[PDB]
Design a protein around this ligand. Structure first.
Ligand code: L9S
Length: 263
């Protein structure tokens, strides 16, 4: 798990956020890595460190690979994803995506989430902004579980000003009821983000208005590029009743069937 920071060569900035700075680098002169440099005071680092052991055993081809941690200082060393943030990827209209490509990004994500669900592991913050894209156009799930160590309460509480209201089911917004089925809800919103080419969910609403809308039964409506069958899959994620929402196993079966049918 422990990486010697001396084996790292820093090369380029990839991205900055509230919790850290990610740089493109090499490990022992040769191997491409992303180095996540945690900002001092953003993170419950000693809690994270014990968690990093269960995370070092999470391994799936659609899950951004954790390589290790540098904890004698603090850095997280992960798989480098050359096409970067999925949300930015979706907004680049130059890709001129076929709907078959969009459905494949949904499947990549669903495969990752099916694996996490198999391990009773919650993402807790599934959204396009937390997916990455590799050099072969493969989507992988990133930053799964890490919100649990974020010290800023504007990010972590449901009433917080940086909480992911637009990816949260009513039982989360009302009661803080987090479950496999809040990830299923989030996944539905993600499929919407993909098929909308990276529009903000509830584009015309505030987070306050989104929460009021969701509570009354308002839903995201069908993106132009989504077929009726694709829309049926994303909408199935948004049942008012958590126990009426599919598993990730059932969602992956649904996506595969539409891939075969071509909806
Ligand atoms: O701060 C992060 N991650 C982070 C920070 C900065 C940048 C990036 C990615 C980095 N980018 C990458 N480009 C290419 N290969 C890559 N591999 C890994 C990241 C990456 C290029 C795109 N960037 C997006 C910005 O444009 C991510 N995680 C995090 C944490 F350390 C501590 C606590 C919580 C969190 N989670 C909680 C929920 C969300 C964050």
């Amino acid at each position: 798990w422990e990486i010697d920071p001396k084996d790292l060569t820093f090369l380029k900035e990839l991205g900055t956020g509230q919790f850290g700075v990610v740089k493109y680098g090499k490990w022992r002169g040769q191997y491409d890595v992303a180095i996540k440099m945690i900002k001092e005071g953003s993170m419950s680092e000693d809690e994270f460190i014990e968690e990093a052991k269960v995370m070092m055993n999470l391994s799936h081809e659609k899950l951004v690979q954790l390589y290790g941690v540098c904890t004698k200082q603090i850095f997280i060393i992960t798989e480098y994803m050359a096409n970067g943030c999925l949300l930015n990827y979706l907004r680049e209209m130059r890709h001129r995506f076929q709907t078959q490509q969009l459905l494949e990004m949904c499947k990549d994500v669903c495969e990752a989430m099916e694996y996490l669900e198999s391990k009773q592991f919650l993402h807790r913050d599934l959204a396009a902004r937390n997916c990455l894209v590799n050099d072969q156009g493969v989507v992988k799930v990133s930053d799964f579980g890490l919100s649990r160590y974020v010290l800023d309460d504007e990010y972590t509480s449901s009433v917080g000003s940086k909480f992911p209201v637009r990816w949260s089911p009513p039982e989360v917004l009302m009661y803080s009821k987090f479950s496999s089925k809040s990830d299923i809800w989030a996944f539905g919103v993600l499929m919407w983000e993909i098929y909308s080419l990276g529009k903000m969910p509830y584009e015309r609403f505030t987070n306050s208005e989104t929460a009021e809308h969701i509570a009354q039964g308002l839903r995201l409506y069908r993106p132009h590029l989504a077929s009726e069958k694709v829309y049926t899959i994303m909408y199935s994620c948004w049942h008012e009743k958590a126990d009426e929402r599919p598993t990730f196993k059932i969602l992956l079966s649904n996506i595969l069937d539409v891939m075969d049918e071509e909806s």
